[PDB]
């Protein structure tokens, strides 16, 4: 009860508000399929890849649990990005605690998915472990030491795979505890709504209205997940990870998981090591700055035309960066990516705060 059943909710929250529960479901799904995969997975470099093929070929229904876990991670990100987008557009970030915990949640899920991808020890697993851990080498004086310490050696090897299984195993449960805290802070204020105006004069009980709406949403999530698992399980994956890890050779068209492509495009656009790493970190951490950059007298973008146009420009820009991340470092992609990377920070740090002020002026306040 009162944390669910009689929880007061706005009468008008839309489908964009369904992603929170969908994220909860993605988390449970990953935990359930994850544990079952962990019952047959072995983390030794001599047998990791083999154990995964054993799961898919000989464990009863091992293939469906595996592809549900792989595609579940993709659904997790689709939902995460929709969830964050809803927050930016509707000004949900003014719930500061809830929002900042959310940023931590995004980073932890990213770190979690990164480590899981390393587990099957295919080519992408190995080079992803190499590149991403090396981001830390940009840290002056001690960076290289931190990397070797994380690796347990001078290069990615057995020690790395074994600890990554352990980290990947426990992190999702930590994410679950952090998510419960996320919700507790939210409950102090209750939900925001499409208008950005207090909904205290028109609250309805969460049950039965949103319990049934969340179930309908859950059904649609499962449809999307199963369309991928049963009809195109490899569509969102990378063929190169069907090749066992080879420490002597980095595939020529190596590219990150699709949900990391925008950030990878940003890092790749800067021909400097420390600069690229700082831009990468900032492309995510800037989310923590959004609240301080809010200039509008109104909470939501619903009644703000100029802000809406810039919001969709940001989404279109992330789509551009995602596309660029999938292309080779050649002309004219190098320049398009640099513009897109600059446009990303420019929209968030300058254009949106400015549109907010102009809109205020136009309304005479």
């Amino acid at each position: 009860n009162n944390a669910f059943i009689d929880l007061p909710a706005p009468s008008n929250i839309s489908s964009w508000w369904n992603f929170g529960s969908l994220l909860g479901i993605c988390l449970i799904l990953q935990i359930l399929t994850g544990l079952f995969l962990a019952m047959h997975y072995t983390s030794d470099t001599t047998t990791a890849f083999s154990s995964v093929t054993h799961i898919c070929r000989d464990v009863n229904y091992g293939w469906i649990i595996r592809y549900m876990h792989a595609n579940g991670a993709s659904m997790f990100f689709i939902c995460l990005y929709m969830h964050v987008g809803r927050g930016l557009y509707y000004g949900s970030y003014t719930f500061l605690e809830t929002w900042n915990i959310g940023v931590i949640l995004l980073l932890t899920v990213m770190a979690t998915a990164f480590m899981g991808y390393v587990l099957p020890w295919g080519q992408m697993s190995f080079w992803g472990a190499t590149v991403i851990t090396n981001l830390l080498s940009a840290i002056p004086y001690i960076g290289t030491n931190l990397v070797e310490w994380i690796w347990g050696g001078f290069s990615v090897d057995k020690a790395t795979l074994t600890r990554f299984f352990a980290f990947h195993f426990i992190l999702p449960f930590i994410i679950m505890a952090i998510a419960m805290v996320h919700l507790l802070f939210l409950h102090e204020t209750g939900s925001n709504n499409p208008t950005g105006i207090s909904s205290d004069v028109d609250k309805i009980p969460f049950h039965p209205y949103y319990t049934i709406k969340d179930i309908l949403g859950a059904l649609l999530l499962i449809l999307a997940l199963m369309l991928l698992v049963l009809f195109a399980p490899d569509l969102l994956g990378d063929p190169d990870n069907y090749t066992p890890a080879n420490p002597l050779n980095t595939p020529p068209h190596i590219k990150p998981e699709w949900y990391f492509l925008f950030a990878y495009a940003i890092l790749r656009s800067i021909p400097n090591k420390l600069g690229g790493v700082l831009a990468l970190a900032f492309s995510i951490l800037i989310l923590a700055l959004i609240p301080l950059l809010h200039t509008s007298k109104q909470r939501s973008m619903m009644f703000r035309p100029l802000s809406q146009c810039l919001f969709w420009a940001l989404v279109a820009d992330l789509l551009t960066l995602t596309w660029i991340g999938g292309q080779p470092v050649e002309h004219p992609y190098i320049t398009i990516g640099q513009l897109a990377s600059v446009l990303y920070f420019l929209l968030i740090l300058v254009l949106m705060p400015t549109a907010g002020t102009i809109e205020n002026k136009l309304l005479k306040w």
Binding site: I64, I212, L216, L223, M226, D234, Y242
Partner: protein, 241 residues
């Protein structure tokens, strides 16, 4: 060169969303792997038992396994020995290690084929195109010895000589073994090898689509039922005047 030739889309009978693999074609494809590809390519994740109920009966598979000798042991003297293969044995490797493989192939390494279709963009469209696409080098292109021109291979220079051609093997069912027929069947077999769950996921997908066709509108109806209380509600403001 850095030029790329992408493979066209062949109308595989298993291409459709609800289309299963052709099992007679898997069976002929296995014969191709066996007679032709196995002398250079391993298939480390497929065992004879996997063929049972897929393209061969348990006895046929048993007979197939016995056609080869595999190492076992140690016996009571602490020694290894050879024995006829059995259903639980994985397909024999042509080389003990990649070094021996490279040595036996002018330095190139025939990759393992268990996942080749899932490990290559284009999958069987790519593999079929590669196998049936060898041709003379274009004017101005000269390859080092050991390399063959194949427009579909990245860089167009491959260390594998054309492995198939008309009558490279004889099929158990008399199907004419033309190069294209052989390629088509081995590719179907390679799909099955990379994705044995292929037919079952599509059968399940049919059931998922039907169930969703039923559950989605019903739950939606449940949603609209409950919400009608709010969707048709009427408000009136009556302040004191």
């Amino acid at each position: 060169s850095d030029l790329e030739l992408h493979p066209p889309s062949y109308p595989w009978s298993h291409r459709g969303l609800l289309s299963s693999l052709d099992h007679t074609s898997i069976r002929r494809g296995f014969q191709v792997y066996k007679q032709v590809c196995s002398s250079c390519h391993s298939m480390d994740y497929v065992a004879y038992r996997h063929l049972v109920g897929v393209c061969y009966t348990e006895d046929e598979a048993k007979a197939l396994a016995e056609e080869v000798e595999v190492q076992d042991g140690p016996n009571e003297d602490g020694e290894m020995f050879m024995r006829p293969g059995k259903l639980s044995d994985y397909f024999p490797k042509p080389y003990p290690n990649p070094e021996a493989a490279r040595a036996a192939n002018n330095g190139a390494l025939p990759p393992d084929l268990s996942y080749i279709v899932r490990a290559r963009h284009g999958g069987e469209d790519y593999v079929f195109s590669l196998l049936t696409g060898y041709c003379e080098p274009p004017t101005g292109v000269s390859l080092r010895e050991g390399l063959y021109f194949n427009p579909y291979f990245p860089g167009q220079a491959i260390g594998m000589a054309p492995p198939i051609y008309n009558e490279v093997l004889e099929f158990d069912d008399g199907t004419p073994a033309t190069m294209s027929q052989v390629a088509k069947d081995v590719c179907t077999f390679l799909r099955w090898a990379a994705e044995p769950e292929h037919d079952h996921r599509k059968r399940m997908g049919l059931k998922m689509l039907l169930m969703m066709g039923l559950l989605l509108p019903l739950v939606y109806a449940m949603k609209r039922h409950k919400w009608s209380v709010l969707k048709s509600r009427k408000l009136a403001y009556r302040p004191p005047k």
